[PDB]
Structure formats: structure tokens, C-alpha cells
């Protein structure tokens, strides 16, 4: 197919990158605007050198190198009612509501798919028009259900069999034998020798932009998200009217323009005031998220696979700015300084940039989500200096199949560790950033590498892993060291983004049942020799590798959500009312962004503790004996001791014998551990962790 | 919490030991490996006991323990290496709300008399099904040749 | 306390019908859904009108209505 994209503000750049990655047949990109400093804060294809140049020509080569098999082309001139008819779909980003109306009316009068995507500040707006009659083939996104059969017969209402899904009633099914579908008791042949169902296409009617603007129809999962979307739409209309009337965009954080914008609209006056004040720049996370959504809509408007979006979509993230009980950014602070961050500084300020320049972060897994996270980090400026940095850790090599999901990987870059090349690409994004690659898995066998000194510098961890065991282990390490965790997970079209902040949210609760399934031993007698019950007979020889091909739209969305979370994670202490977990299903237009739960407390005989808490007990000057330790525990707290063990070895028992107990009571804890386990104590380790149970549970931190 | 529950259950098991278990012992180094000696009552398995292991997983509640034997028992439900199949510990039957005592009692029931339903050793299953007299005559000789010293 | 019928939508696109009373915990409905769909209770959660649903609270707290929709959300790995 051939797709036209108009306006490479950075949202258009994200859309074009997604389309080229997915494999769009031909892409024509049109942008005459010259590149300025205020455009580098979100556009990852430009640079400092490509300044005072047209965005289209500058980004053409960078987009072409991504696939080299899509033939990206640049158009110079103007869009008339001659080039519109040659493209299957036209995407427009950041127009002026005049070109929007003209192109939309022309597209509706000629029957071509029309998309409008806009990102002003933190708020994003999307609009689709697929025409007056669009037919979609398979609005399921899942394999059609199947069932087995044994035998049938003949009857006027019909007779069906079922050998052991639910087929409901009245739908269409297939198999008489290899014939047309028959509606169903199956809707002249009395004999008996699997069954599969089929789906129906759906028809959808859309309106033109001129008609749709009069009365919108927004996609909302509840009823409290509709008035909010209406207020956002009114604010966007007021902003467009202001831009047309005055001829300039409102100044960043300017209090004089906000009054005019508010008076023009007149409703949520505070909301429109706040969006007007902050509508001055483009940020990498919001751009990435809206670009992922728009690219998915464009792709589903070509294959006609999933259900088109409704008229309007509005995305609102107004919780990344300082809270009400804080200091708002000032116009002097949010002033352009000729550096490649003016987009962020236009809404946040130079103080936030200074804060973000120093943080040090760890990234586990340089893969699909990892590359997008690296790009978002590079464009925002985590580190990029001498007082900060970044670390990337991964263990896998690069295979040929990684090229189809290779945002930062090249064909000549096969056969070398992923962490090194990912760090090299991130350095290429800006040389100021310093990234350290480590090719060692983070599992309970290389713990000596990642000790206390290693986590003494890390200020946060971002995990992008393809397992539950590794995710639970990383969460356990992070909660041991009391560090924020940023987790993301994608599968097909489903995606989730979550943040775990110590002492204000709940700890990561891994599903134990799921993690047990992975690395399961050979089933000795379930089905090995006699039985063959289901299709899973492949286990006899040794779903084979559990391969899930992720699409580039989900990874971009989850990366953008993670960046949005980071924006307020590195913004100091927050009251837990300003944190969100997000779940999204793009194919069904499902998006939820909710407030997480407070940590759950547990109470024993007299002990009130959460999942973050721990027991801290020091030692004496030479050392303290086990009897002294138990006495101190029973004195400071009411907790008695029944069993006290260290890992897989136990040091104490509630009842063994007077002799067995008196053998161990007058001994040093370190001496006892060395006596049980012949391995020497770790010199780098400072704190020993002990597990204890009362008579009849937070760990014991033995500060050596 | 797979190293806490095992040691919390071993004490309870030793409090009221079953009549068919003897020398229930641990290593005190790794708390996730047990030891025992059981003397089955049904003949010709009443002569000598047999050693075994109750090896535990790193996540015991959500995985079945491995109950590999150690002696040279001849029985049409155990492999020549020492492994044994039990329906209680299976992917379609294992549950996180089951104790080790029920597993061991099911083991005792299984070793009392072969179930001849899903035999792991196909050679002895046919001999038991057709001519039990020869199988009984040879099992005692095999146990005498290889078996424990005494219960 | 009269029984009320609601709709539960799963990840495969279907929307089954359940009969529950607004006096029992969400854990009971999760067990019902686990039995009807054959997935573990710890492998997913439920969502209604955006906000998730806590296991230990009665369904009357959220304020459901007849023939309402409750979505399932799996705990997904990969990436
Ligand atoms: N615990 C871990 N430590 C380091 N790398 C990991 C860990 N778990 C997963 N990974 C890596 O994360 C990447 C996930 O793959 P993908 O989901 O395709 O990006 C792979 O490169 C894995 O090797």
C-alpha cells in the first residue's frame, strides 16, 4: 500500500517509523518546515547538524535506512486535489484547522482514509474518517474456536455432537462436508463417519470532519470520562481559535494568554486553563504513545482486520507536573536557551532538566521494549553528563529473527551481544549520554557481581523481561534494596505498564502458578507412553518455544507510558495519588490508566508490617551470641523464636534436645554459618539476611 | 517460602510418625532433602525395607517433590533406575494445598499391590497379568539378592 | 439480595453471562470465572468502569447494575 504523511513534527516521525517497521509498501512524506532547536526534544531522526533544513529531506535518509525495502520518498511542493487520489490513506499531524478542514472535505468527497493526529503539551487528540461505508473482515484478533466431533445423524431440526468451547446459537459454522456455512441443532442424508466456526464482516459508517466537529463521539470506558473528553475538545477548539485570531501560539506558561483562552471557550475552567498554560512543547513519551495508536489505526485501515476506532480519541496525562501543594514553573524558568531540550523546558523548566541530568538508572534486557526505553531515555536526558549515567544488562546474542523487530539493530550487527550495540546506538542518539554494558544475567548465580556497592549508586531499575521467574527475582532484589521499579509487558496487542514505589504502593505480586510452568521437567507418566489426550503430543520427542511475535505499536505505547511514569518518579516524593498503572488493548480500543493500591498490612500476635518492612538488628563489638540475639528479639519485640534458618540451612530449632540446643546456643552467628556451609563468607557482603518464624514474616537483617 | 514449610512439616510428621516409616532423617545442611526406610507389609515385600529420597523443588507448593527410590526393588510400577509414577503428583493433579503425608500414604498404597493400570515397567506388568505365581516366586529371590539388611 | 445477571468479557472477545448476588466477595466471582474459563485465579484480575476490583470486597460496594460488563485482564509476560 501507499501512505501519505504530512507533518514531521515528531509525532509524524513516530508514525512513519512504526509504519516502516511494520512493512508499509510505500511511504510519501511531506514537510517544508525548517528544523529549529525547539523540535529536537521529541524527533529522534534529526540532529544538531540537520538544522535550518526541511524536516522531510533531513529525515528521508534516516527513515530509508530503517528497512531499505519500502522505498520511502519525499514530496516537495503542495498538496492539491491531484496527489490525494493516488494514496490509500493520508495522515496529517499538527495542522491549523484550515488545512485540516480542506483536506478532510476533499478526502470525504473522494473516499480515502483520513487520519488527524495532534499533540499539544501533555494532551493528545486523534481523529479518524474511514468513509461513509467501510467493511471489516475479522474483528476478533484471535483464532476462531474449534471443537471435535464423533458422529452425526439426520433430523428435521438437526442433530449435532460434542466430544470433550461454546458456539452460542444462531451463528455460522463450517466443517455439509466442505460446503457453505450453515446457521444453527444443525440447520436426506442419514450416515456417520472436527468443527470450526467462521466470523461475519462488519459495516461501519463514518462522517466527515466538518460534520463530526459539530457533535463529537469520543471513546470512553465509563461515563466520567465523557465530560472530561468534551472539556478537552472544547479546550482544543479554543486553542485553535486563539491561534487563528492572534497568529502565534501562546507563550509557554504565559498567564496572559491563558486568560484569553479561557474567556474564548466560555465547563472545566481549571482544566482548560492548565492545558492552555502547558501547551507549548512536544514530549517524547506522549508523542511515542500517540504515534503507536495512530500507526495501529492506519494499519487496521489497510488490512481491514480489527474494528476501526470511533470518531475521536483524547489522551490526558496532567499528573506529571508538580502537585497543587508545590511551585509551578515560571515564565523566566521556562525560557528557550538554544539547547536540544527546549520542548521539555517549555512546559517543565530548567530545574527539572537539571534534576534529570544527574540520575543513574539500570535497564534489564536490551530487547524489544529495551530499545524503545533506551530511545526515550536518550531523548529526555537521563544522565548525559559526568554526575550521572546509565547501565544496560542483557545476556542474549543477536539472531536473524531479531531484524524484523530491530529498532536499533542492523543487519551487519548480527553475532555480537545486544547490550553493546544498544549502548552504541544510545550513544549515537547523543554523545553526552554514558552507558555501561554488562553481559551477565541477573539471577541467583551471579549475585557476587551485583553486590551492595553495585546497588549503592543505582537510583532506579527498569525491567523489560520475557519471563515471570526473572521478573520476580528482579522485584525481590529491588524491594531488598528499596528502589523504584518500572515494569512493562506486551503480548500480541495487549500491553501493561506498571510502577512500584517503595512504602507507597504495593509490591510486585508475581503469579506463582504461571512461573512454575516454565522449565517444567519431562512428564514421566501424564502422557508419555500409553496416552495421547490433546494436541500436545510434541513433548514425546524431547508452543514448542512459546514464541510471541510482538508488533511495534505495543512496544512504543508501553515505553511511552513508562516514560510518563518516570517523569513523576524523578520528581521527588509524591502522595501515591499521582501514580498510575495502565492496561491497553489496541485492537479493541481499550485503554485504562488507574491509581494503584496501598500496600497491604499483616498483623501477628503483636506485629504490624507491610511487604516493604524488615527487621534490623546490629551486632556487638567483637560479636554477639545466638542466645543474646534471641533475648534481644524477645525483649525489643514480643516475638518468640521457633525456627531460625538462613536459606537452605537451619541454625536453630524450637525443640531438638537440651544437649543439641546447648551445643549451638553459645556460638557466633557467622561462625555457625561457616560451620554449616563450608563456603567462606562474602567479604563484600555487609548485611546478613535471616528467616525466622514465631511460636506457631519480615526478614531479619543481621548487620555484620 | 519453600525452605520454611518443609522444615515446618517435617517436625509435624516426626511428631506422629506413620507406622510404615523408619529412620526419617535429614541432612541439616540442605533442608530440602529427606530420607526414610519403609517396610511394605504385603508379601513378598515384607522381608527388607527400601531407601528413598523425598527431594523437594525450589518452589515446593507449586511443584511435585521427586520421590526417587534408592534400592533395587523389583515391582511393576517403578523403573529400573529407581523412578516411580504416582497419580497424586502430576501436572493435572498437583495442588498447592496438599501435604507430604498424603503423598507418602498414597505411595504406601501403591507399593502394597500393583495397580496394573499405567505400569511404567511393561515387562513385569504382563508377567503379573498372566502368571502371578512366577512373578511372586521371582520377586522374593530378587529382594533377597538385593535389599536392606533389616527394618 | 435477589440474584442479578451480569456479563463477563474475556480476552478472546466473548462475553459470557453469570448470575451473582450483590452480597458476596469478588473472590467468589473470580472462582466462578476460573471454573467457567479454566484459568487460575492468580493469573488474571477483573476491571469495571476503569478502576480494578479488589478481591475481598463485596460486589455491592462498586455498584454494579443488571446486564453490566466486567472485563478480564490477564497478567501477560514477554517483551
Ligand atoms: N533476568 C534477566 N537478566 C538479564 N536479561 C534478561 C533477564 N530476563 C530477560 N532478559 C533479556 O531480556 C530480553 C527480552 O526479550 P524481548 O522480550 O524479545 O525483548 C532478552 O534479551 C533476554 O535475554
Author numbering:
A (entry chain A): 33 to 196, 201 to 211, 220 to 228, 237 to 239, 243 to 248, 252 to 324, 341 to 616, 845 to 998, ...
B (entry chain L): 2 to 152
C (entry chain I): 79 to 157
Sentences from the paper on this structure:
Using cryo-EM, we obtained a 3.45 Å structure of the UBE1L-UBE2L6-ISG15 complex. Using a chemical biology approach which allows the capture of these transient reaction intermediates, we cross-link the active sites of UBE1L and UBE2L6 to form a multiprotein complex assembly. To prevent non-specific crosslinking, the non-catalytic UBE2L6 cysteine residues were mutated to serine (UBE2L6C86only), which was also utilized for UBE2L6 in a recent publication by Olsen and colleagues. Similar to other E1 enzymes, and as seen in a related study published while our paper was in revision, the UBE1L structure consists of four distinct domains: the adenylation domain (AD; which contains both the inactive adenylation domain & active adenylation domain), first catalytic cysteine half domain (FCCH), second catalytic cysteine half domain (SCCH) and ubiquitin-fold domain (UFD). The adenylation domain, which activates ISG15 via ATP-dependent adenylation of the C-terminal glycine, forms the largest contact surface with ISG15. Interestingly, we observed density extending from ISG15’s C-terminus into the adenylation active site, indicating the ISG15 C-terminal glycine is adenylated in our structure. ISG15 is located at the center of the complex, with multiple UBE1L domains cradling the C-terminal ubiquitin-like fold (C-lobe). Interestingly, the N-terminal ubiquitin-like fold (N-lobe) is not visible in the cryo-EM density, presumably due to its flexibility during the adenylation reaction. As anticipated, the active site cysteines of the SCCH domain and UBE2L6 were located within proximity for disulfide bond formation. The last domain, the UFD, adopts a well-characterized binding mode for E1-mediated E2 recruitment, where the UFD engages the N-terminal helix of UBE2L6.
